[PDB]
Design an enzyme around this catalytic site. Structure first.
Site, PDB file in Angstrom:
ATOM      1  N   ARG A  99       0.826  -1.193   0.000  1.00  0.00           N
ATOM      2  CA  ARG A  99       0.000   0.000   0.000  1.00  0.00           C
ATOM      3  C   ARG A  99       0.869   1.255   0.000  1.00  0.00           C
ATOM      4  NH1 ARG A  99      -1.700  -3.819   3.458  1.00  0.00           N
ATOM      5  NH2 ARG A  99      -3.868  -4.573   3.369  1.00  0.00           N
ATOM      6  N   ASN A 131      -5.562   4.366  -0.319  1.00  0.00           N
ATOM      7  CA  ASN A 131      -4.283   4.044   0.321  1.00  0.00           C
ATOM      8  C   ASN A 131      -3.152   4.936  -0.197  1.00  0.00           C
ATOM      9  OD1 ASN A 131      -4.269   1.850   2.301  1.00  0.00           O
ATOM     10  ND2 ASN A 131      -5.151   0.599   0.657  1.00  0.00           N
ATOM     11  N   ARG A 162     -11.770  -9.230   9.277  1.00  0.00           N
ATOM     12  CA  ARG A 162     -11.027 -10.410   8.857  1.00  0.00           C
ATOM     13  C   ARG A 162     -10.633 -11.194  10.105  1.00  0.00           C
ATOM     14  NH1 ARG A 162      -7.681  -6.813   4.348  1.00  0.00           N
ATOM     15  NH2 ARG A 162      -9.235  -7.194   2.695  1.00  0.00           N
ATOM     16  N   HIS A 186      -2.857   0.857   8.650  1.00  0.00           N
ATOM     17  CA  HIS A 186      -3.349  -0.194   7.736  1.00  0.00           C
ATOM     18  C   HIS A 186      -2.230  -0.514   6.764  1.00  0.00           C
ATOM     19  CE1 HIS A 186      -6.240  -2.617   5.605  1.00  0.00           C
ATOM     20  NE2 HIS A 186      -6.129  -1.921   4.489  1.00  0.00           N
TER      21      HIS A 186
HETATM   22  N1  LIG Z   1      -8.526   1.395   3.617  1.00  0.00           N
HETATM   23  C1  LIG Z   1      -8.770   0.179   3.208  1.00  0.00           C
HETATM   24  O1  LIG Z   1      -8.952  -0.740   3.968  1.00  0.00           O
HETATM   25  C2  LIG Z   1      -8.842  -0.133   1.717  1.00  0.00           C
HETATM   26  C3  LIG Z   1      -9.460  -1.375   1.242  1.00  0.00           C
HETATM   27  C4  LIG Z   1      -9.507  -1.597  -0.169  1.00  0.00           C
HETATM   28  C5  LIG Z   1      -8.973  -0.638  -1.086  1.00  0.00           C
HETATM   29  N2  LIG Z   1      -8.386   0.548  -0.536  1.00  0.00           N
HETATM   30  C6  LIG Z   1      -7.854   1.537  -1.506  1.00  0.00           C
HETATM   31  O2  LIG Z   1      -9.063   2.111  -2.075  1.00  0.00           O
HETATM   32  C7  LIG Z   1      -8.722   2.710  -3.336  1.00  0.00           C
HETATM   33  C8  LIG Z   1      -9.786   2.373  -4.356  1.00  0.00           C
HETATM   34  O3  LIG Z   1      -9.918   0.914  -4.461  1.00  0.00           O
HETATM   35  P1  LIG Z   1     -10.829   0.317  -5.612  1.00  0.00           P
HETATM   36  O4  LIG Z   1     -10.841  -1.149  -5.475  1.00  0.00           O
HETATM   37  O5  LIG Z   1     -12.142   0.989  -5.684  1.00  0.00           O
HETATM   38  O6  LIG Z   1     -10.066   0.737  -6.928  1.00  0.00           O
HETATM   39  P2  LIG Z   1     -10.555   0.982  -8.413  1.00  0.00           P
HETATM   40  O7  LIG Z   1      -9.347   1.050  -9.307  1.00  0.00           O
HETATM   41  O8  LIG Z   1     -11.556   0.035  -8.728  1.00  0.00           O
HETATM   42  O9  LIG Z   1     -11.248   2.411  -8.340  1.00  0.00           O
HETATM   43  C9  LIG Z   1     -10.444   3.590  -8.131  1.00  0.00           C
HETATM   44  C10 LIG Z   1     -11.227   4.616  -8.994  1.00  0.00           C
HETATM   45  O10 LIG Z   1     -10.574   5.918  -8.727  1.00  0.00           O
HETATM   46  C11 LIG Z   1     -10.688   6.709  -9.867  1.00  0.00           C
HETATM   47  N3  LIG Z   1      -9.744   7.813  -9.882  1.00  0.00           N
HETATM   48  C12 LIG Z   1      -8.378   7.853 -10.114  1.00  0.00           C
HETATM   49  N4  LIG Z   1      -7.856   9.060 -10.047  1.00  0.00           N
HETATM   50  C13 LIG Z   1      -8.949   9.858  -9.751  1.00  0.00           C
HETATM   51  C14 LIG Z   1      -9.015  11.241  -9.561  1.00  0.00           C
HETATM   52  N5  LIG Z   1      -7.987  12.115  -9.633  1.00  0.00           N
HETATM   53  N6  LIG Z   1     -10.281  11.788  -9.264  1.00  0.00           N
HETATM   54  C15 LIG Z   1     -11.422  10.973  -9.168  1.00  0.00           C
HETATM   55  N7  LIG Z   1     -11.383   9.595  -9.355  1.00  0.00           N
HETATM   56  C16 LIG Z   1     -10.120   9.085  -9.646  1.00  0.00           C
HETATM   57  C17 LIG Z   1     -10.318   5.695 -10.973  1.00  0.00           C
HETATM   58  O11 LIG Z   1     -10.650   6.195 -12.258  1.00  0.00           O
HETATM   59  C18 LIG Z   1     -11.044   4.439 -10.529  1.00  0.00           C
HETATM   60  O12 LIG Z   1     -12.360   4.334 -11.055  1.00  0.00           O
HETATM   61  C19 LIG Z   1      -7.284   2.185  -3.658  1.00  0.00           C
HETATM   62  O13 LIG Z   1      -6.329   3.249  -3.480  1.00  0.00           O
HETATM   63  C20 LIG Z   1      -7.091   1.054  -2.664  1.00  0.00           C
HETATM   64  O14 LIG Z   1      -5.735   0.816  -2.342  1.00  0.00           O
HETATM   65  C21 LIG Z   1      -8.322   0.797   0.843  1.00  0.00           C
HETATM   66  O1  LIG Z   2      -6.726  -4.416   2.809  1.00  0.00           O
HETATM   67  C1  LIG Z   2      -7.030  -4.695   1.629  1.00  0.00           C
HETATM   68  O2  LIG Z   2      -7.594  -5.755   1.281  1.00  0.00           O
HETATM   69  C2  LIG Z   2      -6.703  -3.675   0.538  1.00  0.00           C
HETATM   70  N1  LIG Z   2      -6.935  -3.853  -0.759  1.00  0.00           N
HETATM   71  O3  LIG Z   2      -6.507  -2.676  -1.408  1.00  0.00           O
HETATM   72  N2  LIG Z   2      -6.009  -1.796  -0.423  1.00  0.00           N
HETATM   73  C3  LIG Z   2      -6.139  -2.421   0.742  1.00  0.00           C
HETATM   74  O4  LIG Z   2      -5.792  -1.898   1.949  1.00  0.00           O
END
Ligand SMILES: NC(=O)c1ccc[n+]([C@@H]2O[C@H](COP(=O)([O-])OP(=O)(O)OC[C@H]3O[C@@H](n4cnc5c(N)ncnc54)[C@H](O)[C@@H]3O)[C@@H](O)[C@H]2O)c1
Ligand SMILES: O=C(O)c1nonc1O
Ligand SMILES: NC(=O)c1ccc[n+]([C@@H]2O[C@H](COP(=O)([O-])OP(=O)(O)OC[C@H]3O[C@@H](n4cnc5c(N)ncnc54)[C@H](O)[C@@H]3O)[C@@H](O)[C@H]2O)c1
Ligand SMILES: NC(=O)c1ccc[n+]([C@@H]2O[C@H](COP(=O)([O-])OP(=O)(O)OC[C@H]3O[C@@H](n4cnc5c(N)ncnc54)[C@H](O)[C@@H]3O)[C@@H](O)[C@H]2O)c1
Ligand SMILES: NC(=O)c1ccc[n+]([C@@H]2O[C@H](COP(=O)([O-])OP(=O)(O)OC[C@H]3O[C@@H](n4cnc5c(N)ncnc54)[C@H](O)[C@@H]3O)[C@@H](O)[C@H]2O)c1
Ligand SMILES: O=C(O)c1nonc1O
Ligand SMILES: O=C(O)c1nonc1O
Ligand SMILES: O=C(O)c1nonc1O
Lengths: 329, 326, 329, 326
Positions: A99, A131, A162, A186
């Protein structure tokens, strides 16, 4: 006649997997009107239509629309859930997924979103998902300027979910009755609190004594929890987890919108807790109609404080990095 | 068209306040078809009609019917919830309300019902509600002959719910995140486990040190929990609590019907726990598709052991009393 | 610390069977904080405690409190559901149960409650349940002074619910997919619209022709619908129906609070529809965040108009009578 | 000890967008244990884990597992929802998206699944999602050999949901209270029944006279309904709709599992309805614990008959082509 009871409005800034999934939950539960925003044009309109169709199927009524401008998307938003950003770095092996590597790609995006939130919905409740989570929450807070109780990051509820699922399976009970918590940053240094596991308030130690689970087992569960994200990434091949992340972010949003005062660990602003200042990190907190209404400080022992410290070092290093490399404007 | 997926069936033996309220929950959630049974003529048919009308209002589809024969009510019942019996002793002042006094009035009723379950639905999961709860669960067990894992009494989930609500209010958190438990005999000797109170798994002790709640305050909450039943009895003037009792019983029935494996304290069969045998008493248990799948024997401190022993003496006295009445 | 998302508040003016039952639904669904008010001291507090305990059992968080003053009960109420009143005339046999006989016993009570709403929560949405329903709705409207779109009476959804359950059983389908409506005044002159019955939009006529049901069977269903109230009264021995009535009133309140825009027949204000002026009567309407947002005018044939005119004469006669006997204060 | 109440089990044959989404619904509602199966290795295990985590988050308890083999995936399945197959033809422009073009690509996959269903869970309720739907349901029926009432295809509930959403927006009412039905073959020739549109049973006709909506607007809504699938395909860039399709299939599965007897338009086996025989096509039906318990044969006017005939020609051509291919 004049509208007296206006539906809640939740803006999904980022309409990818998690954004769309959260929109799905809102339509399925008739939780609030939904707005899907993304830099990618077309796709949000497709999801908005698909989701609008859902309301008929499940007999609910909320408006699901795609908005092309920050103004249209953010204005009137009771809550803004930000998932905009990259999930994986191009060309890097799935086995090396981290991440932290997303930092240079998502800092700018989050900062911009925050600047627009300040401009269009400064009174909203911000739930960051992008992230590196804990780092991005701080960037979002700085850029948006919202009160520290009106912003948090979703992560630990997912990590704890989880943790709980694995424990629940080991004990043969519903995860509803497994209270397992993960705190910290995280990432690879998150801290699953094995010592704090309870089954409906009963200490996990009792189940060890009864011979139902072993200490060894619990630590392996903690390890599994820490690497559950990468596990999914590697299994999926493309993208990362979204069903549990979306459900977690919406549970948090719901606790705010309905002033439930649920106790959910999430990335919150520290003003002295655990010895931290001017930063965000995953900690147990109370989410109510006034946002983060309480940050719970657990009594950590020697080893736990050691683990937590490493978790702290992780996010602090990323926070100094972002500040050093940040464009003035 | 051969039926492949038959709806679950829940028989409410006793169609008074709690019975009708449980039927309501079933209709509201489309949990199962409902059968309302009662000795009183007419009333069950009225409530059955009212409840069937509910399905249209809330867009669900379950059948709610009144049955006046044990055979029609019990046959095919996946779960039987028993509330038949009196709630208060005739002529007894509200200030003197005691679940134990109901013994001679409900003991024969429960026995009869058990005998009929034995005859019409010996494979059903029995949830007793009728007081004196823990004593009645044993009477029901003896009369029904069902396996010890297929019978339990709803009581401690209600006591714990109260315990949790009071704690939830004191800490300003959702009771969903308050794990508070009451074990022992459902009566004046029930045992609220203050020591085991957790906030999403976090020890109540740290909240005390943090000044959110005091130890005196918690002890007061525990006492309020013990006397919450009488409090409601006196406020209502007639009858006793039924909304929380109904929800607790249905939550338990649901954990069984859907094999959820929820951890719920209830009156379960003692197979040696704490040195207890051939009796039922409130203990944390796991309710799943196989009925009671686990009984938790928590470690008790000095005070808890003292209070628990009193709780045990209470139900053992009741059981001795019913044995002498038969 | 400042509250941003305040929970909705529903005040149950009348804490008898229906009042307590509606509070149950609110706690079960975490719909809103609940206040139980009643002239009877003690009972409301017992029920509020019982209901507060339910929130723990079902894992929801809403405040359920008894309030003995009109002010504490009504202030801040987003919606007020009024069930205060008598269910049966003392001494009269159950065979002669008539909602109209209740007029002299409930008119004053409803007026008073209305006067209090005018003072404590003039912006609330009023849902009247107390009988005689349609007449009480007018008394409440005149007394509370709220806009005509912010007040209605629950009844036809109950009558239609019964109508629907009987048809559903005859057709072996879920009542969710039976659209059966009863219009007119909630009483012996109510009008079950047999001609309008549909199964997911498909006309009931086809089912008669195809021999699924008979003309007599539907007639008996309509008759049963009309006398269902008295049927339950005679079966219960004491009091009247409360489970479906409660669920109906709350469904209406929910459509308002969540701006669902459900189409529910209820006692609404007529400003020309069906040729009626300055009076309330059961008609299909759209309940949304702006209260009654639309009163649907159905094309009634000769017989339906004749039946409807009879329900109109019933409520008009009561309306004139109540006004003539109304105490100036 | 012994399990008395077993949770229902739904097998998702195909774990792509729709398969994963339906699994999400099952976990969110604690509807049943879920099995995710797919030819693609790895991905289903990823979604299974993600979904198992959801149960903790929303406090439900169902088992979500990925299964490598047909045997492990199908055995014990109370319901099998099939979405295995392609969504678009490789290299074909989005503006040329056609469900019928998927025939050669998915017909073999559906047949294979059917043979495995016959082998491992012959008593299951089959819900086909894979396009070309109406044709694929017939392929599934012949291959699986299940009773004619134990198999159907999800499609019209989706088309109807779209029809209802558009009408609901035009009328400013909840789609819950809009009864709009699309019958026929899921494709460019599906038949939205404008004349049958009702608002809680009230004829749309009156709303037209009242000026709420015009006849021309309703026709535009009907057209939009027909091309909604393609509209989404073009917007998404990759794949096709999955949120509403998932919700529709699960609504159908739930009506079966809980014997709700909901009236849901779906692709059902024809025994003479409209003179149609030995084929499946979208028609109003009643889904209960006995599967398809009734097929409603609505009276159609001249225009509707004409459109319906085209709808029939569409699927007949497909079935004719299928028989020639395998
Ligand atoms: N905190 C957590 O526990 C957790 C869990 C899962 C995913 N995440 C994070 O969440 C984020 C999104 O995950 P996801 O599965 O939806 O990804 P994804 O790729 O499916 O969706 C991300 C979306 O963001 C859009 N995007 C990119 N740049 C942009 C901008 N400048 N303005 C507006 N939209 C923009 C993209 O076009 C895309 O549709 C990732 O950074 C991932 O690492 C965090
Ligand atoms: O925790 C997860 O599964 C994760 N997937 O995308 N970003 C993350 O933090
Ligand atoms: N375990 C708990 O926590 C708990 C909580 C609340 C109430 N209770 C007990 O539950 C019981 C029911 O309470 P309630 O509020 O529903 O009371 P209620 O008076 O409303 O209903 C009891 C019903 O039992 C019926 N009945 C009496 N004898 C019968 C017989 N031989 N066969 C069939 N039905 C018979 C009565 O006619 C009456 O309808 C009481 O004994 C009460 O003390 C236990
Ligand atoms: N519209 C409908 O379809 C419908 C359906 C069912 C019942 N109702 C009517 O609803 C009303 C209530 O029914 P219920 O079953 O709850 O009756 P109930 O007797 O159980 O409760 C009525 C409550 O009103 C209270 N009350 C009396 N005067 C009051 C006053 N001045 N202020 C505050 N509270 C007062 C009583 O003390 C009692 O608790 C009855 O008039 C009944 O006819 C209408
Ligand atoms: N009936 C309707 O209304 C409706 C609505 C939407 C989509 N559909 C159809 O549903 C199907 C699935 O759509 P989707 O969005 O889930 O697509 P998707 O591409 O996301 O998922 C299809 C999945 O099928 C798997 N698969 C392919 N061949 C297989 C085989 N032999 N055995 C097992 N799994 C196999 C793929 O690996 C992939 O995971 C498509 O054919 C689409 O046209 C129908
Ligand atoms: O605990 C109660 O409230 C109660 N009311 O009636 N019996 C009981 O146990
Ligand atoms: O309709 C009923 O059942 C009723 N019961 O009390 N008042 C009424 O209107
Ligand atoms: O109808 C749709 O949206 C669809 N998308 O992919 N196949 C379909 O039938």
């Amino acid at each position: 006649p004049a509208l007296v009871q206006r539906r809640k409005k939740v803006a999904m800034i980022g309409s990818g997997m998690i954004g769309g999934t959260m929109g799905y939950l809102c339509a399925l539960r008739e939780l609030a009107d939904v707005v899907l925003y993304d830099v990618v044009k077309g796709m949000p309109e497709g999801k908005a239509l698909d989701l609008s169709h859902v309301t008929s199927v499940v007999d609910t009524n909320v408006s699901v629309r795609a908005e092309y401008s920050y103004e249209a998307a953010l204005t009137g938003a009771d809550c803004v859930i930000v998932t905009a950003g990259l999930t994986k770095v191009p060309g890097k092996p799935d086995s090396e997924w981290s991440r932290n590597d997303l930092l240079p790609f998502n800092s700018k995006i989050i900062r911009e979103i925050g600047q627009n939130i300040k401009k269009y919905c400064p009174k909203t409740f911000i739930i960051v998902v992008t992230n590196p989570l804990d780092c991005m929450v701080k960037v979002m807070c700085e850029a948006s300027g919202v009160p520290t109780n009106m912003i948090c990051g979703m992560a630990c509820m997912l990590d704890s979910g989880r943790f709980r699922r694995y424990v629940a399976d080991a004990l043969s009970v519903s995860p509803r009755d497994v209270q397992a918590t993960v705190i910290g940053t995280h990432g690879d240094c998150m801290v699953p609190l094995v010592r704090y596991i309870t089954v409906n308030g009963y200490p996990i130690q009792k189940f060890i004594k009864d011979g139902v689970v072993t200490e060894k087992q619990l630590e392996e569960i903690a390890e599994h929890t820490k690497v559950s994200g990468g596990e999914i990434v590697r299994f999926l091949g493309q993208g990362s987890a979204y069903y549990a992340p979306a459900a977690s972010a919406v549970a948090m949003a719901t606790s705010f919108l309905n002033d439930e005062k649920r106790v959910i660990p999430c990335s919150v602003y520290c003003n002295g807790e655990y010895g931290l200042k001017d930063m965000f990190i995953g900690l147990p907190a109370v989410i109510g109609g006034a946002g983060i209404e309480r940050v719970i400080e657990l009594e950590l022992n020697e080893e736990e404080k050691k683990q937590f410290q490493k978790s702290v070092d992780d996010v602090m290093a990323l926070n100094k990095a972002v500040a050093a490399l940040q464009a003035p404007g």
